[PDB]
């Protein structure tokens, strides 16, 4: 069997009878007239098993995949999607954390998107079986996959985010400077090191309370020693407009006086043979809940919301790939004594085969399922967060699924402190964000600390980190509890200064990256965008990575190696130098001129901290505030009143003075080449001339 | 801290502050004018451990230990008590599955007891470290010990007994012949069976359902499929006179809808760390029990009384060493590939070393308890019948430790079918009597199927095992899934017809088997005992083990080898064959003359089936319905009136003729020599005399 | 049964009857009216464990340790004191070849330090067990460390060195230029060397010779070919103002013909049950020193003597941690055919 469904350039293709992970919903099921070969794919159904080929010209690209250790062109590989836990990863290393199955060919010019809908081992061929073809295998009988018409990659995003879920809009504050650590504690100390923050002049958003504050382990409590008084802890954090959010696993101690094990009882996971499966975990032996259930959900839900009730602003779900050390555990038991090296599988930490789940009142394994189990838990922590009348919502997952970007920020995981990092860290979030999951950021400074020799904790190097991630949307430091203290406030006054300066620039500009959030929530198009996102028809752009858009009109090119400044690849088009002012022609390389390369593009406009306002050419633009700001002949339209401070205008035509509405003129000052600056400090009726 | 107490025979030696497994009720708390010198004892306590010494003499033997696989006389070898699930055991191998920490010295002809109160894994080095010595280990830094005076083996037995718990009563059909498989299902088959069985003359008091007839191996459950109608099953055995005896494992199924799970949280056994202690068993992923506490043995004692009220006749608990497959299973999943043999180390079978229990309110270490486990478990297990006001109680243990024989009959496990077999059962059931468990028994014809080539199972082997067990207080056939069937229906005539004669003389005696079983529950005296505890002042008997005393008055002598007669060993004193009626001077030794070589010792007095009686010298006899019976010069006084048929007289002397009550006058028929019959048929208020 | 002494700034506290590695002599002792709260620190007796607890400070700098593969201040991190030897090392690499369990704390820029005389494998937890702690643990029922007064970092390595000792005082000659190499030989190439090396401009203040000197790693020995006149080398090298500094390891050949081997007998490790306790290192099966024994010391010192004689200039003791290959070795005889690899321990 095989149907074929169309609607709003997205195709909706059905072998045999697919049991998805997650049902997607289509508003317009009319059947199409387009054929499998009119759609350039062939279809095989063998062994339990679903083959879709396409073929792949030389010029072809094949972007996507969502969070992997590759360059962001994928073709010549073999992708496997399997969450796993894939510790201290290197790059090259495959799978990792998330699994989103969809990627994008652009072809000529044109986008088209692939999405299939199995959280089963899904492998991506792409031109390495047979070097002219992409080949996918869903290792199920049956199976759903849509092709997603472009002609735009954001086409195909907007189409892909309308069918699996437009991103939940979190607070601003959610995209602020975090302090985390493994972990910080006891509860004094945390308070100490908040106030050190701040009154060195870090505006710190929240703090992260890792697996070091529970009792045991033990999801939902507080140690008794290290936070003896959470409701102290908690209002002293907000007394100073700090945000607390605490780590939850999904690992349920099994203790007979445990609470949660109890009350939990009936909605856990099995195995084929009916009992529990019952593995390993941080709190010792665990069992873990059902999240396919929609009756565990609402179990899940109510603990977050009584949870969320003492005050805690935030949930950072962790280990949900979902993760299990039973199997490793059991190998280490029985060869321990052995002086012989074990090799690092890392699949050894997935849920066994036997495991099993109830999917809409079907018993289905787990191998078939596994990818979209974070999905379910992070529906039910939103969920929890609605329950509890919170409208400010902010939860933080490892893992991730098609739809993942419905309830949560993902990070990247532990990664390791080193020159080459930048580059993968930029891969690993571009990739995510191109995939459908805007919200994402990784640990600045790098997670692992000093288990093992090949880690470098230079301070010039933490500081190249805090300038990498200026313009992502997750902004947080995170280290190992082995690791050095990385707080900017133990740094030397040298380096100090300078991480204190890039936190203060993100501030500046966390205006324009919230109103490019609330557009990832209305539209689902990524806040941090590859080049060729934007300039999709030249091939050049496809083999940038150490660059990156944010949104439409900020290019930013970070400096990712020793030197004190690099080669910039600017696309087509004029770009105006933000620190010197020059504008240059696109479709060139030119030398930066400042530690922090930013480019904005002819046609941008952006709100920076404190009303001020950068105008560059003719574009349209809604701020997160809802109002809108257009800009065209020599006139800059608002939507409604607003105030406005300070006014800077690129322009290499001179500007004399300012007309606000048609009114009161404004003293113009060029403060440098191609640069106006208008002191204004008033609210705008509705317009403002330029003269 | 050292300190003797006293009180009749004795000596409590208390070493530092010890903390037993289970506390014996000492009649009063006397202080005692001896010290360890006089004791004959040395002490020592070091890392933990408390070592005691004694001296060992070349003609000192010593006894006891309960169930090991050796010679009744333990000089020479380093015992281990662990219970411990054997497998299939061979002789020679230590430790099984009961531990009784007592051991008895007989010196100069005098018996003194040693009682090691300790559940640990107690060793006891007897004349192996040191050839002139016997040194026992308590890993403990306190202990508490016994010293039990004699002279008579039987003399410490009762004191002992008195210290741990006389043996409970059970009712006479529990020492009848018992059939039983692993398993016999579905429940049609079981009927069948026994029809056929009865239909054929055999005398069935009951059948032993294995776990195949539960549910996945679900504790108290009954299978769907093989068993859909109990209710049914019951009735119909019982319509049969033969009661249903059905096993209780002590593993417990992590499974989220099973009620055993869910009702009894709060009260299985943890681990160091606190989580509950899962491991592996029949049903799979498991708890146990943590039988040590006071409201576990409430709780199972509910369940156990809510299962007999089905109708069930008894329990038979099995695996409660108590016995785990997780860490056997771990290796097996690590190494399985490996083309690499395995060494067979029991102790991995034994629960791992981070188990905790909480005994008397303390939390204890599995280690230090271990081998009372089971005795708390059938405690539990009695006090479920009490729950159910049953009167007659059977309960079967295969572990035990000190106390056991107040809630249950002790079978010798999974034996091999062969004729060394035959000669290593009767020293297991002998040392398990002569150590305070009087209702023992193994598994006639032999445990092990044809899952490894050293089994016999051989016809006239099956034979002697029906004969070897002739006076075991515990008579029943049992054999494993893969076995031949050795149900005596389905022998040849040629063997049916000697096993159901073998039957049959059984049942005939089993009114004197039963009388010793009052007298055992009444003074802690054995049913079945070596030669050397009627004779202990004679070396010889200590080196007799293929013949075993029933009682006070029978010797049997066993055939277990392919001969067709054996020599017999006499003790000290005259004996009458019983078949032929010939009579000989003890401290001989002669060819046996019958297929059962029975003697009777002059001063005996056997109730038979019937009311048939036989008498031979003076002697004083308790039936077991109280009624006592002496004989003396030429007279047989009854303490209350009593019906009697056939009586029969064995005498040296003619006789002629006996008078009933000085009234009445009965003729006597000489029917082999020294034998002469009465058919008196009718009551007598109190006397008989003979002429 | 904890006690504390004082003398000019250090305070000796006593947990249970310590035997000490070795006696560091405090001379006017006098017990002290200084508590541990006072101190800021907590004792805790356990499984022939002594675990002693100091809170630590956001603010807070902990240094010392000795040998440490990692950053200068040590919080975050769970250090190891047990010699060993560390093969080719890298960065976070722990334990290393020397432990010295003394570190100091500065806090709110007051020095303090803290010296435990236990020569075992103590453990120092520097806030990453807990957080704001710093918990050393020793594996003896016993033991004597010392609290050392600052204010200034200086002042604790005063009256720390007045302790333990003062640094002796070498020749000037060795802070000068020294060439070696594993190895140089034979013994005309050395001379060979050195000649080129002066000629050239470059002031050789001495040479080593690594073991490759000896006759088949046999201490105190010289090869009877690489180093048939070892008095003509020694002429050569002080001729040209050079010294000539030897290589001595710590393992006695077991050897029927090898004097030390003889002299040395008496004065060897054991093992539990009594015997000598025979191992592997360079030479081969081999036997060592038991150094804490006055009788060894002086047998051992008057080889040196002997060997100091003939004009060596220097000795540079290797492999003393020390060091032994019998487990090693055994290993990979055992599983030397299996077609793995062994990790790195
Ligand atoms: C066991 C080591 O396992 C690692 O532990 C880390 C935290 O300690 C986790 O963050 C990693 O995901 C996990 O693989
Ligand atoms: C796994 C094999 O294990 C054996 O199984 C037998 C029953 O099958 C039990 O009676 C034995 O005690 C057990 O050791
Ligand atoms: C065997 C390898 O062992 C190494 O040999 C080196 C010299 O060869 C020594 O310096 C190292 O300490 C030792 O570990």
Redesign the interface.
Known sequence: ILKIYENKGVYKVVIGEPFPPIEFPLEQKISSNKSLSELGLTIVQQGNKVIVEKSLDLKEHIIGLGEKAFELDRKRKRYVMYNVDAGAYKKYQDPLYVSIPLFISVKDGVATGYFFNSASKVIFDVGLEEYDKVIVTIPEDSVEFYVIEGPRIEDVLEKYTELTGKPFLPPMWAFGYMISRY????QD?VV??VD?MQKEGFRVAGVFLDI?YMD?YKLFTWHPYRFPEPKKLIDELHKRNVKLITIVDHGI?????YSPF?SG????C??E????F?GKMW???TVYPDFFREDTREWWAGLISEWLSQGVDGIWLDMNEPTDFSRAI??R???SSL???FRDDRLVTTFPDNVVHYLRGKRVKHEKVRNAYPLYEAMATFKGFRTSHRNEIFILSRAGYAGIQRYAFIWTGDNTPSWDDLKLQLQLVLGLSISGVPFVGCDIGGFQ?????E?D?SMDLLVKYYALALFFPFYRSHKA?????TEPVFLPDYYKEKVKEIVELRYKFLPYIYSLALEASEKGHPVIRPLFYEFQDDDDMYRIEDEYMVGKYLLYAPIVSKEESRLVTLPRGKWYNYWNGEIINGKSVVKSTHELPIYLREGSIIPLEGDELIVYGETSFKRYDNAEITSSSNEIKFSREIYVSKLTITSEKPVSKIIVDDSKEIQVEKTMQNTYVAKINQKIRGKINLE
Chains 1, 2 share one sequence.
């Open positions: 972990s910080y504690y006891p100390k100490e090191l050190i070091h045991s101690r099994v203790d007979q006086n109890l009882m009936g909605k856990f099995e195995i043979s009916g009992e529990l019952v709190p010792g032996t059991e190998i038991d029985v060869l002086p012989v090296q600390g000093r288990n093992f020799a880690i904790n509890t082995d690791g050095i203290d």
